[PDB]
Design a protein around this ligand. Sequence first.
Ligand SMILES: NC(=O)C1=CN([C@@H]2O[C@H](COP(=O)(O)OP(=O)(O)OC[C@H]3O[C@@H](n4cnc5c(N)ncnc54)[C@H](OP(=O)(O)O)[C@@H]3O)[C@@H](O)[C@H]2O)C=CC1
Ligand SMILES: COc1cc(-c2c(C)cccc2C)cc([C@@H](C)C#Cc2c(C)nc(N)nc2N)c1
Length: 157
Amino acid sequence: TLSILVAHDLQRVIGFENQLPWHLPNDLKHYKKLSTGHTLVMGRKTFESIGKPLPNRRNVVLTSDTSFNVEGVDVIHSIEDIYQLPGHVFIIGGQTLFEEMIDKVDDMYITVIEGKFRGDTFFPPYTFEDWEVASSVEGKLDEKNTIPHTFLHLIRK
Ligand SMILES: NC(=O)C1=CN([C@@H]2O[C@H](COP(=O)(O)OP(=O)(O)OC[C@H]3O[C@@H](n4cnc5c(N)ncnc54)[C@H](OP(=O)(O)O)[C@@H]3O)[C@@H](O)[C@H]2O)C=CC1
Ligand SMILES: COc1cc(-c2c(C)cccc2C)cc([C@@H](C)C#Cc2c(C)nc(N)nc2N)c1
């Protein structure tokens, strides 16, 4: 199966100057959980901002740069390449990837940040008519997680 995994605010902002405008450990913990034992696909400029890759899951990068051959990471160069990848595959960003993939994924896992942050990169608009709300869970807030957030699981009708 093919899923989107994203965190966006109330105006679908996802990043500002190449990092997440917010910091929310519980999203990261939530993000962390589902990814384990699966494939993750990202645009070069997303991987760039992480540098250090994630343990215990197949990290794949999409770039047209054949020249890049960075240690311990699989490379692809087109969308077709994605179709030919076993197991459960996750689209993790960034924008230009989400834009391309939103109409191809089976379901979506969205953390909705209940706020309005300044951003320069966005998640594509989408209507609930196309999307069965399979689940909706309010995130708990403590001292380390100060921002209201909702974990959604949207499935295409
Ligand atoms: N809130 C969230 O859940 C997340 C937010 N972000 C945010 O996203 C922002 C980055 O967004 P964006 O600029 O879109 O970054 P991307 O990682 O999506 O960079 C896009 C790159 O992917 C490659 N690419 C995309 N499509 C193709 C294709 N069809 N064929 C070959 N290569 C392709 C290109 O690389 P190349 O030119 O080398 O070929 C392109 O430059 C950051 O600000 C970051 O903070 C990122 C992930 C998650
Ligand atoms: C090292 O672990 C990361 C750290 C950051 C990071 C943070 C949290 C703050 C400042 C700068 C950076 C680079 C970003 C990520 C990216 C890959 C992601 C993601 C993502 C998340 C967090 N949630 C949902 N739902 N989808 C997502 N694709 C991973």
